Each structure stands twice: as structure tokens, then as C-alpha cells.
């Protein structure tokens, strides 16, 4: 069962919205928003959202298993050896957020303090007095991003795996010798950095210029999570405040993959007319620029929606029913609904780029989407015993080598349960980089957006205060 | 009571260390080391110091006063009005950490969101509602360095009352207009920027060609804590590692403030010889250039420490007994020390410039001194009721305005308990921009360092475990 | 009769390598080798070379026609108006080197200090006084590369020409208003920085996507100068240096030019066997990225030429027979080679780009090709008592308005002989820009670098010493 | 005779303002005004001043001699040997221009193409093999700003001399070894690049904060030239047009300097009362921050000319009959004085620096100053012959070794006149960089512009066209 086989299983599910019925299924663990800072509902003027991994959210493993084969015929057609044609994407390996070193060629999982967790090299998994060789410190500076890249996205999960099969095979490959910055065949070296440069480059190809867009629209039902709920929730928000997306991808794109997250025979419930996907948004913008969206952005331009193709001109205009936007900044958005930063609720999956951005720079408040946490949430909870003596185990070796080498086992073992790079949020008792931003910039966050749909209209989502340590 | 006075009164204090008078005394919130991460002081190898406001805490008001005045005569003599010399340093409005808005001449505290949670235009302390006039969104971008400028450190509490004085002064001197960004005196316009970077031109010059250090040296004792116990724990640092200081000042004043701190008629306890100060490190480094110095750094070079003059060369020996370094990087204290990051805790007072850098760049641990705890501590303890008043309250409100005007008004008196802009680490029940990077970049801290005298050698310090929402 | 038709009758022709014959020939202005600086061919130890422009000389106006119909075609793909499709490209308005103005959508010609000598708006010339209405200083900063474009390569000649249809056509559409910066359509305002933004992208991508290379290649005899004294030329060099190509076109394309160019059915001599083209050079590299590589440059690497692919990895090997490179940096070539910097002689069109850049950056030796000259020549042979016209006027005018009025009807007259932008280097009395580069960058230049055939191996280029003013 | 000599023998000789009188004599080279572009001073509307070296022409070698001795001392008091205080400044070394490589400490004069002319190590002049072990292509990159530092300004005349002392001391100390890019001294290296850097840093140092300034006010008859003439021509400009005063200096300097220039018993002509300097300037500007004047300059403030402070405040009225600027831009020239670039002259002696950035940034005409040129024309017209000799030889070679080293012997010859890095201007028949410069960014050129007063006032300066080799 992969994580958006759970998300599809509950997509299935009809809005039973009587009240005492809402309330017990967002007791549930699967359907709960979970909340890091307070936030108050009834105060939200402006939904807004991202449409990639949060609207349209792919089928895993199939879409990441696409992206994977069609990166590597693009790198067989640029000149990799046909070997490469062998792999095949194997979603038990890679965990999001993974840093590539492309010094060393290693994937790491660290900690918000750089401090590593897990190091792989190939699909050789490093021990820690090993890894002192190469991290005399266990440590790395991951803003040296001349170096380090971390794979953050959704997107980045076939590369992630890529890049470890990449290694293991010219590694194993008898002609080439194998260095400690890359791979030698006689007058030709191969650095980790080249290597990790074509490979960006190849999965940059792929979804601009190659035919990922193509075979996903072609075959919508294989690639993307659809669920009638969308447009029930989505109406609801539009009753009490302004609703807009804001996505890269182009109109086109767009189109095509809204108007199927939107083919029903009904509208928001069933017995219901159906709408077009458009009329459920006060503000549509297409090719966004995220992250230079949330700064100086681009210009204001205005989509032709009957070619796909942007009109002559800059945008001065008043916001218009039926008009469709492209490029401008967070600020055309903010000027145009009347909104002001806290009134805001963006809702999105790039922890970096959208979410992290629309904080820090403008204030808005913000939703995160984590579609891996439907399927490591009955992970946690099945596995809570072996957390729970994790915890023992940590707490009886403070108070004071048997200790030491069981920590490891279990830690091994609960690690395990979630793949061979452990859970997204964790290895053990230490947290990852991940889980630290997603505490630190995701107001609200939840394995779907859709999870609003359980709460009522001005819930007020309660955190606990935080105390130094001084103050406890 | 200042917080130098509460720090001078328990360094006039001799040092038991019977086992449990040393247990007893650490229970005392006020000579406690308080914990964010775990550290195992086993692993220590290396114990590194800044020195202004670290090992020479400068007494209070008295040495902020004696900025301030210097300050104010610099701006005098560089053509501002004579009226400035009949301000008078006041300790009870400065809190550390505010934010100068270069735009509107307000000082703002901020939570670490960048939300407003006072503002102060002069010695006008301007309301909600009237806020939103020039903060729309009650938020600023702390980031925008051409805006905004953070006053973190002890050397800028002078300087954050001097503006509030001048900004004051102009307001109500009929020979100026007061305009939006500014004052106007027909033909010429000061704007609030460039009256700040006056200011801050200002104090830079007294700090380095005015005559601050002189004033100072020439009376050490009204303007330098000074504690018996600084050797001894310095002497037991050094049985167990090495010990390292690095400090942007230069040796001259190094050499007299260091000379100071160790005139005592004996060495690191009662009845032993004296020793001098340079004896208790093993690597002396001046002139570092921190922040500067995490990075790339500059050149390492030699002092001669007969004429206080530079060698000619960079320095490219071994580490010699008796040689003091200038320049250089964080890489030659590992280098020469042969450590680790791990392996280093870095103690001193300047939470951004070194302890966030040190953590950040090089993954050194990290000691924060917080000269201002010794005397917030002591309110924190005295008006907890207020606090637990104000916890009860927003409890309250949650489970749903009279509530509402009484939250305002508890806050208010509990924050002018500590000065007119509140704690450094909150107002009411909302944390500060600083108590945020105190908690993440800080993995121990106290009012002074000295509170490790009372901790064992090998003292294991413990911070709870956090987890996630979805994982509590 | 266009400058290509020159080059190719004087292709036609075969060489009689009889040394009176070659004496009497190079007396021509026509087949004459122009000497700014002094060279003496005997130390010139390598001969290196551009493809584009300097061996493949692209037939006038046919391949500036093709190159602006693709990129009308491409502008009317992304929205711009079908009118557009009824502009032709029309060789005698553009002349190389205009600056496009993108702030008031002129094209200007201008002298080496910025002045005005010629502005357009659209096809409507602007006299002197109305051009003080926007440049009150006839005077532009052409280092301002925001607001100016500089339209110096052959490449540009069909978008020189376009920039002025498009401002016409704007300006002359009734659904559009001329503003000072653009057109204005209700809602839409597009400026000329955009517009001009619009079409720089779109030559862009006819020259990288699109089907300008396709259309070149299925009619090499329409659209390429092909000369059988070219390997004869070649050949000769080899006997006396080493022969080097470094292209920034890649090697599909490099290869199919190239085999054109030597496709004759003889080798170097009528009578000789065929040889293929790669044996007339010891280092040939493409993907050559100038200007970068008269720096930093890439990253070296090899050609596998069966495939027209890139091997994987930077090759580190030696200069091989048979070897193809891409990348690299001019240092590649000094250190494969084993030339310094005066030892070769650099033969291009790209005045700017390559030209200066081996002069300034490598002190390399230039030669500097421009195909105008082979038709410029004639103007200026033929038209050469109108310039002495020209100059008596000046002379008389300075000894002391009907004078001046003269002097500007002359002035006219003579420019719209070489067409409606003058002549590539000046505008009567007055040098352009272009000229004061050619003068101070190219030690050689030719309408063709074939001219060299026709001076003798260690012939001794002499120019003028030049004299200051107080020297004279 | 040094060039200030002949300057202060020209400056002793009342105006004889007969026009025959004037017209003989600007017949003599030493009072003519040289010309590289026409400029018809009729249509010049503004005339615009820097000081230093322009209008206070500092007497040579003593001003030299002190500015050496201060940066002798202030490098000894920061630790540098003792030896130092034996060094004399000698006037016969240092040429202007010379480019000091701080990777191998040499002097190098260069040609406009980087091609060396002259090296020195120390005192010891390089030969040309030799030369080539470090300068392989007897090339430099001049714009490699991290490597070269060229010394243009007649204030760099003294460090220029300073440099190769300090390279020759410490080649010849035996406390030193000598290596290829600096000095070991057992543990301590001292690159070449740290020596230059102290150098640099303490010319600075005597500037801003040492005693030069005092030194130079305490004697001003020893140190600066004096003309009855200058208030006499300085009337003279003002009849016609508007004259500004932009120098980077101080308020309190200028005023001591320009105070000292227009002390005589009369005003602009004997008899005629004297009038304050600040009268003969429509706008005068302090503290003009050039080059970064000629962009976007700084702040336009004023000054307080009884205090000699700034007034509070950015400047933003009219111009004022009586009011000192500080600071601005040269927009602020052009907006006070409603002047456009052509119809400007600015006069200075900063051929970088001023010359060039106003001609190119800003199309003003250009005056250049070269006090230099005084003695220097002397010595051209009393060795014309030796030159003579030298260009019958270049062309006696040209028409084809006895020849070659007979080349060498006259160049050194005549070289050796100048000094011992020669003129100037050029190396024997090769012009310098500097020669190069002055051509291109001076549209006028003399020893002082004191000689424009034997020019009437709307005198057309004629220079020949340029003409292109193919049109010549």
C-alpha cells in the first residue's frame, strides 16, 4: 500500500456532513490536520494553493517510476551507457530530503544541524566509524550548495534513486576504476559533480521539454488521485473567503489536469450541476516563477484561454471574472483579492519554495501537504512498541555498552519498517532537516488538504506554547 | 539591582566544591546552566572564549552609559545640535533585539515571524490600530538589511536609546517638520536612514578611534565584573582539554582587560602562586574578525607581543607555547588544537555573529552568555503569578472580550516589570525573535559561563526529546 | 550586386600562385589584407580560426531573409499578430552595429563616445533638433546594458531590421496608442523593452530549436560561399604553424558545413586527391562557448564522432590525431598546442565577442573578417569624390550656413549610397563605433580571410607608427 | 629642472594680453594646448574644475619626498624594519603609469595591449629573455585587478618608488630568503601581495588621517605652485560661461589651498581688487566621492562654511549664491547649473579616475592636465634627434641585427633621458598605456591649463580626421 493508495482509498469515501460524523472521523489520525503555531480559522479572508503534488496529487509509485524511465533514456540519448536501460525505479529506496554529495557521490540524511544520520554510497549503507573517513565531524555544511543539493521534493524522488543506481553501477563496472571523486576510463574522468549535473539536467528535460506532460495527460487515471470531495471542499472555502491558485505550469497543463480533477457528473455534491474547474477560484495565475514569485516575481501578463498563448502586453488591468493571469508577484495577489499576508492560508508541498517563502517573506499562513505522511502515519502507529523502547532505552542509559548496540538495533529495525532511507521525519530518536522545517514553517499540515473538509468553518487550531528552558 | 550587579555579588563569592554544596548550589535557578540540546561534557576536547561580555562583562549601566555619552559627543562634534548633550542614558527603556525601521524611525520587537509585537515611534508606544497605518499585515520582512536593522548585541543598548532620543528630540523641536520618513528643516531633509546610519557611523568611531577603551582601562574596576572564581574554572577546564580564546579585539586591549581579570594575589585558588592570564590557554587568537573568521576568515599572522605590533608574514609555524596568533580562521584552531567541531564548546555572548556561525558553519557546540538572565530570572520567579495568570486566560478564551482587554492589560504589567520594551525573551505570552535563536542555535546557556564551576566534569546535560505534532 | 556575390565571384576564380601575379593582385583594395597594427607572418606560429562568418560565409540577403522569416514565424507561434507574416525582409535599411534603444524604441548609430549620428523610430528618421527631445545630450551611455542592445554580429541583421518593422507596424495599428515607452491596448501595455525582449528571444530560439539549421543544411549552394582556394589556403598555413578551429556551433552542425566547404573534387590543388576537411586542422574544438572560454572557460571534453555525442567525462589526455574537443578555454589550446599568446594569429568576424577578447584576454594576434567590406569597398572607390567633397567642406567651414546645410546634404548623400543606415563605419565625416573597434582590436582585416593567400609566407604587415598630438 | 620648476617660472610671468603678443606666444610648445579631437570653445558653456593637481599644482620632487617619508614612518610604527627611515626619495626612478605585479614584485610599463616594455625587480632591470620565465607571452591581463595595480595618479608617484626599495631591501637584507612570490623569514612569509597591500594601506593612511595635509598648509609657498595668472583666466571663463570647483577633498583643506592660490595684493589683474576664492565659482562641490560621482554619486548635502561641518540634512533647494556643496553626483552639476554634457569642459589630471568616467558616463568634454608634460617636452625637443635616428632605423629594418641591437642601444638611450623608466608616454618608438589613455578620453591635453588663457575665447581647436587604413 502505497501513500496515495491511502489517499485514493479515503478520495473514494462520500462527505458524510452531519456534524457528530465530522467529528469523529477527524479523530482519526489519517484525517486530522495536525498544527504547529495556533491559528484561527474564522480570521482566513484567502484560500490559495499550488496545483503539483497538492491539487493533483500523482500516483505513487507509477508517476515517479515514469519520470525515472524517462530520465534515463534521456541520458542514454545524450551518451550513457545502455546499461542504464536495466534499472528500473524501486520506491523502497529513497526517502525525501536526502542531501546529494557531490564530492564524494554519497546520499546523506542529516539532521537541522547538518549532523549525519545516514550515509549511502551506491546502495552500500556507511557505518559510523567508516563515514569518519570522509565527515571527520559527521557533519556537513549544507549551505555550501556548490557542493551539496538537497533532494527536498516530490519530484526529486526518482533522481534520488537514480543517483544511488548511477553509482552502484559504475562502480561495479569493470571499465571503470573507480576514484574517490568519481570514475576513471583511461583519458576520460567522470567526477560525482558531472554526473549529478547531467542527471538535474536530464529531469529538467523531462518535464520541459520531453514527454512526462504528455504521457501523464494521456493516461490521467493511472498518474493522478482524483476525489469527489475536492470540489465539495473547495466550494465551502469560496462561501466564507476568496479562493486562488498560484502554480508554475503553464495554462495548458493546467487545463488539462484540473479539468480532470473536476470530471464528475455533478458539481461540489452529488445531484448537483457541474461547474467548470475555474469557476471554484477568484484569482487563477499560471507560470508563477515560485520562488521569485514571493519577491520581485515577473511581469503581469494575461492568458489567452482560448490559445493557450499569452496576450501582447503587461497586465494593468482590475481583477475580472473569467481572466486568467501569468507571472506577476505574491503582491498582485495580495493587491487584487484585498488581502493582507495573515488573512492568507496557502496550502502547498514545497517545503522550501512556496511554503518556507510565503512566511518568511510576506507572513502569509500556511498549510503544508506531506502526501508520504497517509501512508508513515500507519507506519508510526503500528510501530509505536519499538519508538516507545527506543524512548526507554535513551532515557534508562542517561540516567547513570549492551545500551549503545541495542539503540542501534532498534533503531535499525523502526527505521526498516519505513525503507531503506527510514522515515522522512526521523532515523531513531533524531530528527531529520524535514521534519525541523515542517515545524518551523507549516502552520498546519496533514497527509491532504482535503482534511479541511472535517472541521468547521472558524475552528480554532490550538498548539501548545512554547517555554525556554529557563521559563519551564 | 542590575543584572552586573547580581553578577558581581556571586562572584565576590568564594568557590566551595565539596561534591554537595556544588549539587546544592546548581538547584538555584540563578547558577544554573540551562539546556536546549543534550551534551555529554565527557566529549568536550576543547573549550573555546570571546572575551568582551563573555570573560569581561562590562558592569551595568555604567558601561552603556559611558557608550552613550561618547556617543552623543561624537554626534556633537560632527555638527548635530547642542541639545543632544542633555540627554541622559536611561537603562529602564532598552530591551536587546529591537529592530530600527529606517523608513518610519520605530523601534519594533518582533517575534521570530516577524510579527509586531511592540512599537515604539520616540517615546510614543503606538497601539494596535494605529500600527496597521504604517504595518498593514502587523509584519515586517527582517530580512529587508536595507530597512530593518536588529540591534542583538550588548554594544548596541546605547545606541537602541540614543534613537529612540533623537527620533524624540526632532518630534519636538519646533525648528523641524515632522514628515513620514523624516524631519524637514526648509532646505534640508533628515531622513530616520540617514540619521541611523549617523548613529551607527558614530558608535563604530568611538569604538575604534574614540576613546571608549581608554576610558574604560583607566577604570577597570567601575566598568569590569571581576570574580576570583574565573581561574579556577578556567584551571579545571584545562586538566580535561584544551582551552582557546578568539576575539575580534586587538592584544593591546586584550592584554589589559585579561591582565585585569586575573589580578588577584594568587591563581586559580586561594594560597597558589599567581599565573599569568596568557598561561591559562592554549591558543591565544586577537584581530579574528568573527564573523568572518567561520568563513574564510584572513591571513594568520603573529603578534609581537613585546611592541602589541604584527610580525611581518603570515604565519606559517607550528603552535609554539607562548606565541599569540592574529587573524586566521575557525580551520587553524582545529588545525592547531587538533579538533573537531563536535569537540568544541564555543563560549560567548553574541548569539547572530558567533555562536549562530560557529553552530551553523562549522558545527561546533555552543554555550550562550546572557549577561541580562542574572537579573531577568529574578523578575521571572517574583511575577511567575502574572505568568500563570496569563496562561489560565488564553486557556480560557480558547474553549469557547472582557477576556480579551484583560489579557492586554496582564501583559502589559507583567512586561514593565522588566523595562519599558519588555522581557529580551517575550511580551506576555508571545516569544521574541531572540528567545527563538537562543533556543535553536544556543545548546546550553546562563547568565554567565562561570556556571559550569558547579557542574562535574563529565556532567551530562539533558534536554527532552521533541516530536512532531503528529507524533505526540 | 550583395557583399556575398563579391566573395563568390572572387571564389570562382582559381589561383595562379605565380609571384608577379599574386604582387599585382593583392594591389587590389579588393583582395587586400588591412593593417592597423604591424604583423610579421614569419612569427605567427598558429593559425586559428571561426567557423560561422570567417569559413562559412553565409550568402546576403538570402540567409538574412531565412533567418527573419523564421523568427516572424516563431513571434506569430507565441501570439504575436498575423500581420506580421506580410513583412520581408529588406537588405538595405540595416546596417551591423545600431544600438536599439529599448526604453523609446529607436535605433540609433553612434560614434565611439556615445554620440548621436543617426536615430529611427521605426522607418521614420528623426532629425537633429527632435532628437534633443529625448536625448538631450545626443549623447547615449552605451554601457548602460539595461536600456541598450548593441546589434553587432551578422546574426543581428535580420533582427535590426525587425525591431523596425514592429515599431512601424505598432505604431501605424490603429488597435493600438504610441505611448513614449510603448503601445498601449486598453488593459495591455507592451513596451519596447518587452517587445524587444520578445523578439531577441525568438532569433534565440530559430538559431537553437528551431529550423534555422535544418533549412541551411537541405541548401548549402543557396544559402553558403563556397571557394576551392580555401584548402589551398589552408593547406599553405599548415606548411608553416599549426591550424586550429574553435566554434561555438556543435559538431552535427560543424561537420556538415565543413564537409560542404571542401567538397570539391580535388584536395588543396586542382589535380590533388580529396582530403577530408578534419585533415586541415591539428586541434579542433566546438561547443567553444566564447567569450567564457577566453576565461574560465568549461569543462574539456571529447567528441565521439561517430555519434556526434559526448563521451562521458573531461578527457585529460593528450593532443591525439583524430581527436575532437569540446569545451575547454583558450588556455586548452595554448597548453595542446604549445603556443603563447603572440604566436597566434585569431581569424573571426565577431569584433566584439572573440576579437577583442583574445586581444585583451590572451594578447592573442587578430584577424578580422568583414563581409560588408567586399561591397563597402566598391561604395567607397566609386563614391570617393563625394567624401572629398566631404573633407573640403570641413576644412573650409574650420578656416574663418550655407556651408553647414551643404555639408549636411553631402553628408546624406553619400551615406544612402551604402544604404539607409550608412555605412558600417561611419556617417560622412564621422567614425561609428564599429570602426573605432576594428581599429583598436584587429591587427588584420579583410572583406576575407582568403586574402592572406596572396601574400607571401613571412611577408611583414606594416602600419604607421603613431604619434601624440605634442609629438607630432 | 623638475616640471614644476617650469610651471612655477611660467606662473612668475605677468599676462601680456596684446593679441599678437598672445598669439606668439602659444607658437611655443610649452604654452600650447594639444589637441586629439576638435572642440570649438564657443559652444563650451561650463567649465568645470577638480584641485588637486588641476588648479593646486603640487611642487615636485619635495611634495613626492614628503608624501615618502610619512608613508615610511607610518610603515615603520605599524612594525616594519628600521632600515626603512635610510630610504631618500628619488625622483629619478619613478615614471606615472608603471603597474606594480603583486605576484612576483615587479615594476612593469606596458603598452595599451599589456605587451611589456620595461620590468623591474627591485632596482634591477629586467632584460628581455629573462623576462619570459615569468611573463612567458611578454604579456599581462591588466584588468586581473586581484594581480595589478597600475599607478596612475601623480599621488602614486611616491609609493611607486617606495616598492621597489621595499623589494630591493629585502632582497638584499640577509635576514631574508628570497622566493618567487615573496620573502621567508623562518616561520613568517611575506608575499609581495601582503607588501603591497601595507603600502597601499599607509599611502591611504598619511592621506586621511596623518599628518600630510598639515604638513603641506604649514608651508604652502614650499609645497604648491602659485600664479598670478589663475585668477586672471579663471574671470576670464567666467565672462563667457559658468565655473564649478567638483574635488573629492574637504571643505577645510579646500578652503586652505584655494585660499593660498588667489592670496595676491589684487584680484584677477594687478590693481583690481582682490576678491575671495568661492567668487570665481558658480557651484562649488566637496567631498565629490569621484568616480562614484559620475554614477550614482552620494547624498547632496551642505556644508557649514564657518564650522566647516555639514549642516543636517539632505540638500534639496536651488542653487544659492554663496552655498558649499558636499557629495552629490554630476547630475547635480548639470540639473544646478542647466548644462548638458558637450557643454561642459571639466579640466583635471586624473586620467582614470575623472577624465575617462566623465567622458564616457557622461559625454563631457575633457581637459587633461599633465604636469609632467612641462619638463617632458623639454626633454622630446632636445633629443628629437636621438628619435629621428629612431624611426629612419624601425623603417631602414622594415625595407628587407647589427640593426636590432643598435634599435635597443638608441631606445635605451633616449629612454634614459626621461629617468629610469622612461617617459611617460612611451618605451623608444612603442607607445604606453598612459599615452594610449590621454589620446582617447582627452579631448585637449597640456602641462597646465593655465595655457588656454593665451587661446581667445571661442578659438576652434582642430585635429585632424581619422581615417581606416582601406579608406586611407
Not at 546523506?108 to 552500500?124: E, I, M, S
Not at 573507480?178 to 518535464?207: I, N, P
Not at 499540515?445 to 468547521?456: G, H, R, T
Amino acid at each position: 500500500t502505497s501513500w496515495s493508495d491511502r489517499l485514493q482509498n479515503a478520495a473514494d469515501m462520500p462527505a458524510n456532513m452531519d456534524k457528530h460524523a465530522l467529528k469523529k472521523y477527524r479523530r482519526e489520525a489519517y484525517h486530522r490536520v495536525f498544527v504547529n503555531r495556533s491559528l484561527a480559522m474564522e480570521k482566513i479572508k484567502c484560500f490559495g494553493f499550488d496545483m503539483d503534488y497538492t491539487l493533483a496529487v500523482y500516483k505513487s509509485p507509477e508517476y515517479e517510476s515514469l519520470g525515472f524511465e524517462l530520465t534515463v533514456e534521456r541520458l542514454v540519448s545524450i551518451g550513457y551507457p545502455q546499461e542504464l536501460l536495466s534499472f528500473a525505479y524501486d520506491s523502497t529506496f529513497p526517502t525525501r530530503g536526502l542531501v546529494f554529495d557531490t564530492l564524494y557521490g554519497n546520499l546523506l540524511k542529516v539532521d537541522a544541524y547538518g549532523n549525519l544520520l545516514v550515509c549511502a554510497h551506491g546502495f552500500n549503507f556507511i557505518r559510523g566509524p567508516e563515514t569518519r573517513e570522509q565527515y571527520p565531524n559527521k557533519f556537513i555544511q549544507r549551505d555550501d550548495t556548490e557542493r551539496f543539493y538537497i533532494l527536498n521534493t516530490l519530484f526529486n524522488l526518482p533522481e534520488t534513486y537514480l543517483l544511488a543506481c548511477l553509482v552502484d553501477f559504475f562502480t561495479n563496472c569493470p571499465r571503470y576504476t573507480s576514484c574517490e571523486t568519481g570514475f576513471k576510463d583511461g583519458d576520460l574522468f567522470m567526477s560525482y559533480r558531472s554526473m549529478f549535473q547531467d542527471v538535474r539536467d536530464a529531469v529538467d528535460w523531462v518535464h520541459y521539454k520531453g514527454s512526462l506532460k504528455e504521457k501523464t495527460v494521456e493516461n490521467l487515471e493511472k498518474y493522478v488521485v482524483k476525489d469527489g470531495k475536492l470540489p465539495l471542499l473547495l466550494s465551502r472555502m469560496k462561501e466564507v473567503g476568496k479562493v486562488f491558485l498560484a502554480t508554475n505550469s503553464d495554462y495548458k497543463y493546467t487545463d488539462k489536469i484540473m479539468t480532470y480533477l473536476f470530471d464528475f457528473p455533478h458539481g461540489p455534491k452529488p445531484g448537483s450541476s457541474h461547474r467548470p474547474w475555474q469557476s471554484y477560484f477568484d484569482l487563477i495565475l499560471v507560470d508563477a516563477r515560485k520562488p521569485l514569485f514571493f519577491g520581485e516575481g515577473t511581469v503581469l501578463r494575461q492568458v489567452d484561454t482560448k490559445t493557450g498563448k499569452l496576450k501582447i502586453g503587461t497586465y494593468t488591468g482590475p481583477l475580472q471574472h473569467g481572466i486568467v493571469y501569468s507571472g506577476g508577484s505574491s503582491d498582485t495577489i495580495c493587491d487584487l483579492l484585498g488581502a493582507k499576508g495573515k488573512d492568507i492560508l496557502y496550502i502547498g508541498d514545497h517545503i522550501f519554495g512556496d511554503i518556507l517563502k510565503s512566511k518568511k517573506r510576506q507572513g502569509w499562513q500556511t498549510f503544508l501537504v506531506i502526501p508520504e505522511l497517509a501512508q508513515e502515519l500507519h507506519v508510526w502507529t503500528d510501530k509505536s512498541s519499538l519508538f516507545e523502547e527506543l524512548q526507554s532505552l535513551d532515557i534508562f542509559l542517561a540516567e547513570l555498552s549492551s545500551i549503545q548496540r541495542r539503540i542501534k538495533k532498534v533503531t535499525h529495525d523502526m527505521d526498516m519498517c519505513y525503507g531503506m532511507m527510514g522515515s522522512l521525519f526521523r532515523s531513531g530518536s533524531r530528527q531529520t532537516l524535514f521534519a525541523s522545517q515542517v515545524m518551523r514553517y507549516a502552520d498546519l499540515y496533514a497527509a491532504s488538504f482535503i482534511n479541511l473538509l472535517y472541521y468547521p468553518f472558524s475552528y480554532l487550531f490550538r498548539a501548545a506554547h512554547v517555554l525556554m528552558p529557563h521559563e519551564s
